[PDB]
C-alpha cells in the first residue's frame, strides 16, 4: 500500500530464531555427558525420561534425551549429540546418538534397526 511509503520504508522479512545454538553449525557435536539422571515429563505423560547433562566441544551445557530401552551411560562419557524435539520435557532440545563413540546400540532391536543402534546379524 502507498507505493511512495513503500519506497520510503521497504518491507522486512520476519525475524528468525536459530534452533542449533548449542551445536553452532554442526549436525553432530561431541559432548561430555556428565551426571546422567532421570526426570519427569509434563503432567499428562507421567513417565521417567532418561536425560543427561552433556557439554559439547562448543562449550555449552544442554540437557539431552536418551532414546531406546535402557542405556550404559554414566559420568562423563564420549558421546555424540544430535538435534531433536521431545514434546514432553520442559526444555530438552537435543538427543544423544545411540551407537556412537561410547554408547552401545540398543540390544534386542529388530525393527527400524538403525535408530537406537542395531546390527543386522553376525
Amino acid at each position: 500500500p502507498t507505493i511512495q511509503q513503500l519506497v520510503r520504508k521497504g518491507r522486512r522479512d520476519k525475524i528468525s530464531k536459530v534452533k542449533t545454538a548449542a551445536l553452532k553449525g554442526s549436525p553432530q557435536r561431541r559432548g561430555v555427558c556428565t551426571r546422567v539422571y532421570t526426570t519427569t515429563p509434563k503432567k499428562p505423560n507421567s513417565a521417567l525420561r532418561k536425560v543427561a547433562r552433556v557439554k559439547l566441544t562448543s562449550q555449552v551445557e544442554v540437557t539431552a534425551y536418551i532414546p531406546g530401552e535402557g542405556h550404559n551411560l554414566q559420568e562423563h562419557s564420549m558421546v555424540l549429540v544430535r538435534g531433536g524435539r521431545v514434546k514432553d520435557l520442559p526444555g530438552v532440545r537435543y538427543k544423544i546418538i545411540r551407537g556412537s563413540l561410547d554408547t552401545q546400540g540398543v540390544k534386542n532391536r529388530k525393527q527400524a534397526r538403525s535408530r537406537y543402534g542395531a546390527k543386522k546379524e553376525k
Binding site: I3, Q4, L6, V7
Partner: protein, 67 residues
C-alpha cells in the same frame, strides 16, 4: 570557490522493485576560468580530465541566466 563553481544536477532512475519513477539530485564541481556565476544560473557541463582533487567538469556556456 576561487575559479570553481558547484552545480546541482538531477536525474531520474526507475526503482528496481516497486517500479516507480523517482528523482535524485547530485552535486558536481565545475571549473570556472573566469568565475562569473550566481545563484541559479543554469549551465551545461561537459566532463574532462581530473583537473583537481574533486573537479571533473568544466564550464561550457551560460544558458538561461538567473532571473
Amino acid at each position: 570557490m576561487q575559479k570553481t563553481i558547484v552545480v546541482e544536477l538531477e536525474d531520474r532512475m526507475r526503482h528496481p522493485l516497486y517500479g516507480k519513477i523517482i528523482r535524485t539530485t547530485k552535486k558536481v564541481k565545475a571549473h570556472d576560468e573566469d568565475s562569473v556565476a550566481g545563484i541559479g544560473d543554469r549551465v551545461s557541463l561537459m566532463e574532462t580530465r581530473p583537473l583537481s582533487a574533486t573537479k571533473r567538469w568544466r564550464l561550457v556556456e551560460i544558458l538561461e541566466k538567473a532571473k
